[PDB]
Amino acid sequence: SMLDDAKARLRKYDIGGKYSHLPYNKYSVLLPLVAKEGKLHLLFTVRSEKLRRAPGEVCFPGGKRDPTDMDDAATALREAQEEVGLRPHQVEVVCCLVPCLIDTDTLITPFVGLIDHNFQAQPNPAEVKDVFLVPLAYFLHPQVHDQINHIFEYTNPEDGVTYQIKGMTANLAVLVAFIILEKKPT
């Protein structure tokens, strides 16, 4: 099946806990995969303009590890619940992808999660201004704008609204699309 095929592909890239004990300032993100209309999509947030890190930017759900978290996956899940209402029974964490090093002292660990078909986002306005889906296949043929560095523009066909996706977020989206969609029969 589509979903069993996705998980099987993702598991080949799982690094597990190999980099998780190193002495960094630690953040996690959740890359949430949603199946709609026979195709895979990624779920993105627009961050509230009020926040410390990355105000008004497109990002994946996530945040800083706290002492309550059992591990790095727990950080991702706690933050996704606070931002968009995703509950534990509504997500299966499939793997941990390569971490992202920034600012000399910070390590961001990305987890890929399969999202239940009855989940409906409830944006928390203190953290998130918007929540939106993008088909995973978009990231194979994106609409690129040079700002010099590369930005993606995605227009939602439901309503005509355009979103800009860039930086670590754009990079991780391309990675997941390559892992799941490369070399597939039609």
Ligand X SMILES: CC(C)(C)C1CCN(C(=O)c2ccccc2)CC1
Residues in contact with ligand X by CB under 6 A are 27, 29, 53-54, 59, 62-63, 102-103, 106, 108
Of 9 and 45, CB closest to ligand X:
45
Query: Strands, E, within the chain: which ranges?
Result: 25-36, 39-47, 58-59, 62-64, 91-96, 100-102, 106-115, 128-135, 144-146, 150-155, 162-165
User: What gap in Å lies between CA 151 and CA 143, rounded to an integer?
Assistant: 8
Of 36 and 53, CB closest to ligand X:
53
Of 3 and 54, CB closest to ligand X:
54
User: Tokens representing 128?
Assistant: 């998130």
User: What gap in Å lies between CA 44 and CA 150, rounded to an integer?
Assistant: 18
Least CB distance from residue 128 to ligand X, whole Å?
A: 11
Tell me the β-bridge partners of 150. Answer: 146
User: What gap in Å lies between CA 75 and CA 68, rounded to an integer?
Assistant: 9
Least CB distance from residue 57 to ligand X, whole Å?
A: 8
Annotated ligand binding at 153? The verdict is no
Least CB distance from residue 155 to ligand X, whole Å?
A: 23
Of 49 and 103, CB closest to ligand X:
103
Annotated ligand binding at 49? The verdict is no
- Which position has the token pair 């008004």? 56
Least CB distance from residue 56 to ligand X, whole Å?
A: 12
Binding positions for Mg(2+) are: 79, 83
Binding positions are: 79, 83
